[PDB]
């Protein structure tokens, strides 16, 4: 029946599978147990990737959101080990060649500076598995922590803590259905 959407702040170490016969933590463990409907993940995140992951009860909405007809930026807050040479930044912004062909960061802004380890905020328009890690890897830099903070026009909710979820209201939901050319819900 009604289209519900959740915004979840995935912690590192959680699986994206619906269940694990070992009892290992999954992104579905703390979601609200519904009935007569089923949460569906809008895409997936690597086990070691934190941040925004949408869920929705509506299969069509999930389809159109991870398969957009328009190129969508994904923004990540990245913590990297040690200080990064400026030329390495030039490479990442000009492009490198990895296992699945060339790739590049559409944007690289240096964020905070925690001791010797550095923070960068980067964006990309593709979404090949572990692309962000492999990008930094191809330039000789290991990734410490990786948070997804924005998918297109959708950022992590401000209050929302690590491992928590927030339900979108009808207006926010309809905003999503509009960005994807779906008719608006009325209740
Ligand atoms: Cl973290
Ligand atoms: Pt997917
Ligand atoms: Pt994290």
Author numbering: 65 to 251
Which lines from the publication concern this structure?
Isomerization of uridine to its C-glycoside isomer, pseudouridine (Ψ), is the most prevalent RNA modification. Here we address the question of how two homologous E. coli Ψ synthases, RluB and RluF, selectively modify adjacent bases on a stem-loop of E. coli 23S rRNA. RluB is specific for U2605 whereas RluF is selective for U2604, but also modifies U2605 to a small extent. RluB (1–251) is comprised of an N-terminal S4 domain (residues 1–60) connected by a flexible linker to a catalytic domain (residues 66–251).
The crystal structure of apo-RluB (1–251) was therefore solved to a resolution of 2.5 Å with one RluB molecule per asymmetric unit. The S4 domain (residues 1–60) is not visible in the structure of apo-RluB indicating that this domain is either disordered or flexible in the absence of RNA; flexibility between the S4 domain and the catalytic core has also been reported for the Ψ synthases RsuA and RluD. Apo-RluB is similar to apo-RluF with an rmsd of 1.9 Å (over 164 Cα) with a highly conserved core that encompasses the central beta sheet and helices α1–α3 (rmsd of 1.1 Å over 126 residues). Differences are localized to insertions of 1–4 residues in non-conserved loops on the periphery of the proteins, however there are two significant differences between the structures relevant to the different substrate specificities of RluF and RluB. Second, in RluB, helix α4 is followed by a hairpin turn that changes the direction of the peptide chain and allows it to pack against α4 instead of impinging on the bulge-binding site. There are three major conformational changes to RluB that occur upon RNA binding. Superposition of the apo-RluB and the RNA-bound RluB structures results in a large rmsd of 2.1 Å (over 185 Cαs), however individually the subdomains align closely.
